[PDB]
Amino acid sequence: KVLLIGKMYDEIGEKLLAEYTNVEIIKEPKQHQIHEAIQDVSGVFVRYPTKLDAQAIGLAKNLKVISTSGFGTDAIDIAAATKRGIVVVNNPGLSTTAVTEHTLSMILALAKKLTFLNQCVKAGNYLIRNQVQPIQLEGKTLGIVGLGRIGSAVAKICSTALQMRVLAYDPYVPSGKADTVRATLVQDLDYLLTESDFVSLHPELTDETCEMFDLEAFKKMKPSAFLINTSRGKVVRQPDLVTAIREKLIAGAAIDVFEPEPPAINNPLYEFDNVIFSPHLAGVTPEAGMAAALSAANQILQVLQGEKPPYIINPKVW
Amino acid sequence: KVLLIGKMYDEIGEKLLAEYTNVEIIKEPKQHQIHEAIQDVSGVFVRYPTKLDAQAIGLAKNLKVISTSGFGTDAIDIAAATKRGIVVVNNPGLSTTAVTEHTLSMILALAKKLTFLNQCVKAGNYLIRNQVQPIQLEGKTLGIVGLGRIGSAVAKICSTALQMRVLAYDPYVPSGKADTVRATLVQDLDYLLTESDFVSLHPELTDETCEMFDLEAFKKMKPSAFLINTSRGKVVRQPDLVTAIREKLIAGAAIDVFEPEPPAINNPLYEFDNVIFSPHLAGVTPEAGMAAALSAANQILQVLQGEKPPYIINPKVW
Numbered sequence A, B: 001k002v003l004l005i006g007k008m009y010d011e012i013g014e015k016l017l018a019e020y021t022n023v024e025i026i027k028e029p030k031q032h033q034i035h036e037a038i039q040d041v042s043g044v045f046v047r048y049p050t051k052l053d054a055q056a057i058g059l060a061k062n063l064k065v066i067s068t069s070g071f072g073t074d075a076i077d078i079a080a081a082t083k084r085g086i087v088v089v090n091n092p093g094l095s096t097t098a099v100t101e102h103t104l105s106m107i108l109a110l111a112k113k114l115t116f117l118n119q120c121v122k123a124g125n126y127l128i129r130n131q132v133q134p135i136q137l138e139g140k141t142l143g144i145v146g147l148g149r150i151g152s153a154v155a156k157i158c159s160t161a162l163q164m165r166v167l168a169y170d171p172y173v174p175s176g177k178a179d180t181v182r183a184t185l186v187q188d189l190d191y192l193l194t195e196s197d198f199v200s201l202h203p204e205l206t207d208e209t210c211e212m213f214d215l216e217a218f219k220k221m222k223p224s225a226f227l228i229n230t231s232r233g234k235v236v237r238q239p240d241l242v243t244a245i246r247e248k249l250i251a252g253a254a255i256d257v258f259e260p261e262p263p264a265i266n267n268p269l270y271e272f273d274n275v276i277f278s279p280h281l282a283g284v285t286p287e288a289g290m291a292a293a294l295s296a297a298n299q300i301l302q303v304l305q306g307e308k309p310p311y312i313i314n315p316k317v318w
């Protein structure tokens, strides 16, 4: 028996679990409903941000595997599952391709001033073509902050396909990793800031990267340069971005993540024609949802068959 | 002596002509000004769309070479120059990279619904994220019509970097040209129409391609597919594109070129949130202007030194 605490991101994951297990789905999970349905199941799927505490894990007698819906596992009492022999697996990185494409879309849209030119045409101001000139990406410098799953994939596209010079700042990756995607790893972040025509943020949100892009960073950036953020809103100190755009410390920005989130209806960034937005959708494609559903459903079956899943969070239990 | 009827797009072409010839530049060219400055010069550069008619060509006693600023030569009386032994050259293909990047920008913008999502957020409708789902390009099929300079460069990027299956339709290109850019050349346009998730137009405008994309073509396209046109406005019958969008025969369109051009304030396409525009700027970058200026200046010098230029429009005079 397998319990789905919340629906999966795609129905393909629920059908696959139904092929091998008896699956019960709680659509709107309450804490008492979990207690009454977890006692005899062998696997548990947890939809973010529903919590799974020591009480529910204590009531789960036959539990062997707990799977979250994505990267986040903060809502799961990991300590309670390790003592009971339960392996816990998450499902990270399954929207790497979606965010990569979304990042490329925003870099290009800023270079071609797409939203502004589209609005000008729709208002009958086709003649804006005489004043405004797009930017050619070939030969420009892309600065990547965070050379992880997405950062590496974005680096690889822009360096080879778009023929950009790619700098990368990431102190926790092997020194040769930038060469695998034809980027140059730099040790000093200030160097990336003064050399880049486009800066794209893809770091993990840590205490070191939190508000890493503040006013001091924007001053070092080229006034003609653009900022792209598809990582986390807290990586950018948003008031400093508002100042950077208004005082023309940079030429524009593309933003998929916000702090605070959701953004308020009257966010001061909304008034600028050189700032473009998407409502935290960079990783949301049908394919990414299916991959997350399949990865979660399949790791449950691996544990129930004695096979080692690839994303164990508590390795000391295997 | 060389006369510049209008400024070149970049000063680099004017300096190169000044190294070998005596150059006069008429910045805002009037017809009588052309008459009074062309009588003794050996070469002429014509900035679009200024006309060079039989009266001016008749007054040009020492004329040997006429160069336009771009592809177009409609404003030049070619017949009057052919009789006088004057070679005419255009300057095509010097913005291949700009149009390629602009094409990619529009393909991505449609897939991510960028302008619509940007408008919703700025209008306080951040919650549109619950209604709208972006498209992932990886694994989709791109159909390229016209596998020339632009079509080939778009094919190569989309097939490898973006991991798309690329089909091409071009009956005048060697069968192996598609393989060099990892595309499949198909003989039946219907095959490309029914198989593509994105159709991007890059053909030369001929009587065969004029209004090639009419209502019959849009009916064969997938209701989920998108159209991108950066080639020429006459390749698409615009009323049929309006019908195709309104009746949802296709899912959206990105348009950089228009028929008629310029588009009017009340274009019926403006009302649709899934149609995006740019005001015929796909090829307009500083780099493209520099290359066009260099090519025009160099073809003038080639003729003045007896060397055959690569883009002669009237070859029967050589």
Ligand SMILES: NC(=O)c1ccc[n+]([C@@H]2O[C@H](COP(=O)([O-])OP(=O)(O)OC[C@H]3O[C@@H](n4cnc5c(N)ncnc54)[C@H](OP(=O)(O)O)[C@@H]3O)[C@@H](O)[C@H]2O)c1
Residues within 6 Å of the ligand: A129, A130, B009, B048, B049, B069, B070, B071, B072, B073, B074, B095, B232, B233, B234, B261, B283, B284, B285, B288, B289, B292
């Ligand atoms: N890189 C650049 O080319 C560049 C640089 C700076 C500025 N611009 C902007 O572009 C505008 C004109 O650029 P351009 O004239 O030098 O480029 P062009 O290639 O000569 O384009 C001239 C026009 O003629 C038509 N055309 C295209 N191919 C043609 C062909 N083989 N034969 C006949 N007509 C053809 C097109 O309009 P239709 O389809 O409607 O007939 C095109 O817009 C200027 O107003 C300027 O604002 C361009």
Ligand SMILES: NC(=O)c1ccc[n+]([C@@H]2O[C@H](COP(=O)([O-])OP(=O)(O)OC[C@H]3O[C@@H](n4cnc5c(N)ncnc54)[C@H](O)[C@@H]3O)[C@@H](O)[C@H]2O)c1
Residues within 6 Å of the ligand: A093, A095, A096, A099, A145, A146, A147, A148, A149, A150, A151, A169, A170, A171, A172, A173, A202, A203, A204, A205, A206, A208, A209, A230, A231, A232, A256, A257, A280, A281, A282, A283, A284
């Ligand atoms: N819908 C969306 O917008 C969306 C979707 C998925 C992921 N994300 C976010 O995108 C970002 C990248 O995702 P990922 O899968 O590539 O993560 P990842 O774990 O694969 O890589 C993150 C990188 O950050 C690097 N890093 C750590 N500290 C750094 C520092 N001080 N400076 C620079 N780099 C540092 C790490 O070395 C690591 O390589 C994450 O913040 C993730 O939450 C957003």
Ligand SMILES: NC(=O)c1ccc[n+]([C@@H]2O[C@H](COP(=O)([O-])OP(=O)(O)OC[C@H]3O[C@@H](n4cnc5c(N)ncnc54)[C@H](O)[C@@H]3O)[C@@H](O)[C@H]2O)c1
Residues within 6 Å of the ligand: B071, B092, B093, B095, B099, B145, B146, B147, B148, B149, B150, B151, B169, B170, B171, B172, B173, B202, B203, B204, B205, B206, B208, B209, B230, B231, B232, B256, B257, B280, B281, B282, B283, B284
């Ligand atoms: N600012 C702009 O939007 C801009 C800039 C430059 C060029 N263009 C336009 O882009 C288009 C392509 O430019 P290019 O430099 O690659 O031209 P190109 O001459 O290199 O290639 C055009 C292709 O069209 C193909 N073709 C001819 N007839 C066809 C048919 N019936 N079906 C399918 N294909 C056919 C030809 O075989 C050729 O290969 C041209 O229409 C050009 O005028 C637009």
